[PDB]
Each structure stands twice: as C-alpha cells, then as structure tokens.
Design an enzyme around this catalytic site. Structure first.
Site, PDB file in Angstrom:
ATOM      1  N   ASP A  15      -5.887 -32.079-142.254  1.00 24.07           N
ATOM      2  CA  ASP A  15      -6.134 -32.351-140.822  1.00 24.07           C
ATOM      3  C   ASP A  15      -6.674 -31.164-140.075  1.00 24.07           C
ATOM      4  OD1 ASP A  15      -3.762 -30.839-140.683  1.00 24.07           O
ATOM      5  OD2 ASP A  15      -2.506 -32.604-140.414  1.00 24.07           O
ATOM      6  N   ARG A  29      -8.339 -28.941-135.323  1.00 27.19           N
ATOM      7  CA  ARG A  29      -7.218 -29.782-135.651  1.00 27.19           C
ATOM      8  C   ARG A  29      -7.521 -31.233-135.138  1.00 27.19           C
ATOM      9  NH1 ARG A  29      -3.382 -32.867-136.721  1.00 27.19           N
ATOM     10  NH2 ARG A  29      -1.294 -32.183-137.148  1.00 27.19           N
ATOM     11  N   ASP A  34      -1.113 -36.642-138.437  1.00 31.03           N
ATOM     12  CA  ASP A  34      -0.386 -35.639-139.148  1.00 31.03           C
ATOM     13  C   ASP A  34      -0.453 -35.940-140.664  1.00 31.03           C
ATOM     14  OD1 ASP A  34       1.298 -33.286-139.311  1.00 31.03           O
ATOM     15  OD2 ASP A  34       2.964 -34.557-139.492  1.00 31.03           O
ATOM     16  N   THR A  35      -1.042 -35.046-141.436  1.00 27.79           N
ATOM     17  CA  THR A  35      -1.113 -35.205-142.928  1.00 27.79           C
ATOM     18  C   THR A  35       0.000 -34.424-143.592  1.00 27.79           C
ATOM     19  OG1 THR A  35      -2.687 -33.329-143.095  1.00 27.79           O
ATOM     20  CG2 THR A  35      -3.645 -35.525-142.893  1.00 27.79           C
ATOM     21  N   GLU A  37       1.682 -31.726-146.006  1.00 31.13           N
ATOM     22  CA  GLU A  37       1.200 -30.382-146.403  1.00 31.13           C
ATOM     23  C   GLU A  37       0.947 -30.351-147.928  1.00 31.13           C
ATOM     24  OE1 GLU A  37       0.848 -27.906-144.005  1.00 31.13           O
ATOM     25  OE2 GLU A  37       1.420 -29.350-142.389  1.00 31.13           O
TER      26      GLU A  37
HETATM   27  C1  LIG Z   1      -2.420 -32.370-133.092  1.00 31.87           C
HETATM   28  C2  LIG Z   1      -1.869 -31.351-132.127  1.00 31.87           C
HETATM   29  C3  LIG Z   1      -1.014 -30.335-132.549  1.00 31.87           C
HETATM   30  N1  LIG Z   1      -0.528 -29.443-131.652  1.00 31.87           N
HETATM   31  C4  LIG Z   1       0.403 -28.388-132.039  1.00 31.87           C
HETATM   32  C5  LIG Z   1       1.798 -28.959-131.933  1.00 31.87           C
HETATM   33  C6  LIG Z   1       2.522 -28.388-133.130  1.00 31.87           C
HETATM   34  O1  LIG Z   1       3.260 -27.197-132.738  1.00 31.87           O
HETATM   35  P1  LIG Z   1       4.228 -26.331-133.757  1.00 31.87           P
HETATM   36  O2  LIG Z   1       3.378 -25.431-134.640  1.00 31.87           O
HETATM   37  O3  LIG Z   1       5.003 -25.572-132.745  1.00 31.87           O
HETATM   38  O4  LIG Z   1       4.985 -27.294-134.630  1.00 31.87           O
HETATM   39  C7  LIG Z   1       1.420 -28.077-134.143  1.00 31.87           C
HETATM   40  C8  LIG Z   1       1.265 -29.053-135.305  1.00 31.87           C
HETATM   41  O5  LIG Z   1       0.123 -28.726-136.100  1.00 31.87           O
HETATM   42  P2  LIG Z   1       0.143 -28.820-137.710  1.00 31.87           P
HETATM   43  O6  LIG Z   1       0.575 -30.228-138.004  1.00 31.87           O
HETATM   44  O7  LIG Z   1      -1.256 -28.454-138.021  1.00 31.87           O
HETATM   45  O8  LIG Z   1       1.148 -27.801-138.086  1.00 31.87           O
HETATM   46  O9  LIG Z   1       0.228 -28.058-133.417  1.00 31.87           O
HETATM   47  C9  LIG Z   1      -0.861 -29.573-130.285  1.00 31.87           C
HETATM   48  O10 LIG Z   1      -0.383 -28.737-129.502  1.00 31.87           O
HETATM   49  N2  LIG Z   1      -1.697 -30.533-129.844  1.00 31.87           N
HETATM   50  C10 LIG Z   1      -2.179 -31.450-130.685  1.00 31.87           C
HETATM   51  O11 LIG Z   1      -2.890 -32.387-130.286  1.00 31.87           O
HETATM   52 CA   LIG Z   2      -0.245 -31.160-140.722  1.00 30.27          CA
END
Ligand SMILES: Cc1cn([C@H]2C[C@H](OP(=O)(O)O)[C@@H](COP(=O)(O)O)O2)c(=O)[nH]c1=O
Ligand SMILES: [Ca+2]
Length: 129
Positions: A15, A29, A34-35, A37
């Site tokens: 993702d 992103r 959510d994919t 890991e």
């Molecule tokens: C998809 C997305 C993720 N994020 C942030 C929230 C999550 O915070 P945390 O890192 O604090 O968990 C993280 C998840 O991304 P990943 O799934 O790439 O880790 O990215 C946003 O802020 N806005 C979004 O639209």
């Molecule tokens: Ca992810």
C-alpha cells in the site's frame, strides 16, 4: 476529484509506492486501505500484486481527495490508478487489503471500496479465505 499524472520510481510494498509527482520523488500511501505487512500472512502476495500492477502500467495517475494530501510521515495520500484502474480498489477486490483508515473529507471512494470488499469476502479471497 481529478486525476493527475505521475511516473513510477519504485514499488515498495502493498500500500505504498514511490512515484514522481510534479517532478519530485514522493512516497504515496494508498487511501482507504490496509494491506498485511510482508512478514504477515499474504504480505508477500500483496507486495507482488501492487508491484506488478504499477510496474506494468503504461500510465500512472494520482487522485487526491478533498482533505489532507500528505500524512504525518510526509507520505502523499491518494487514490492511485494504473491504466485507469484504481490500485486501491483492486487490492480490496482481491482480498489483499481491507478498507481501513477512513477519515472524514478523505473518503470520496469509501462506498466503492466497501462494495469491492463485500465481493472479495463473498468470494472468500485471500485474507477472507
Ligand atoms: C492511510 C492513512 C494512514 N495514516 C497514518 C495513520 C497510521 O498512523 P500510525 O503509524 O501512528 O499507526 C499510519 C498507518 O500506515 P501504515 O498502514 O502504512 O503503517 O499512517 C494517515 O494518517 N492517514 C491515512 O489516510
Ligand atoms: Ca499497511
């Protein structure tokens, strides 16, 4: 919403992808997904799927929603298209991602992706298997 041009720099995982956008390298992103890991069940298959989809595209496009365009890590938040096909939607439709991270004002395609998730789940694909 409007599609804008971009070029692949490199596939990263399920993702996230590195694209050139207005001539600058950016990690994107994928909105609303959510994919798993890499180390997780289906993680290698979700990387492979996105990588093939972006590496094979003749034309990559970026579509921002109505809300914030970059997350707290500096990742661009967009819907990404590969030859007019939405990567975000395709992951979900194949059961290689879940609808996730649905924040108000960046949720234009929520219902579209939810429909695709319902079909993946009906088909018991991948993470729903
Ligand atoms: C998809 C997305 C993720 N994020 C942030 C929230 C999550 O915070 P945390 O890192 O604090 O968990 C993280 C998840 O991304 P990943 O799934 O790439 O880790 O990215 C946003 O802020 N806005 C979004 O639209
Ligand atoms: Ca992810």
């Amino acid at each position: 919403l409007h599609k804008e041009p971009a070029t692949l720099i490199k596939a990263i995982d399920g993702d996230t992808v590195k694209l050139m956008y207005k001539g600058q390298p950016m990690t994107f992103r994928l909105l609303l997904v959510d994919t798993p890991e890499f180390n997780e069940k289906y993680g290698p298959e979700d990387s492979a799927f996105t990588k093939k989809m972006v590496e094979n595209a003749k034309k990559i496009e970026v579509e921002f929603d109505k809300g914030q365009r970059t997350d707290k890590y500096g990742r661009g938040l967009a819907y990404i298209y590969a030859d007019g096909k939405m990567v975000n939607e395709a992951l979900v439709r194949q059961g290689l991602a879940k609808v996730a991270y649905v924040y108000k004002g960046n949720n234009t395609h929520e219902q579209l992706l939810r429909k695709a998730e319902a079909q993946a789940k009906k088909e018991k694909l991948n993470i729903w298997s």
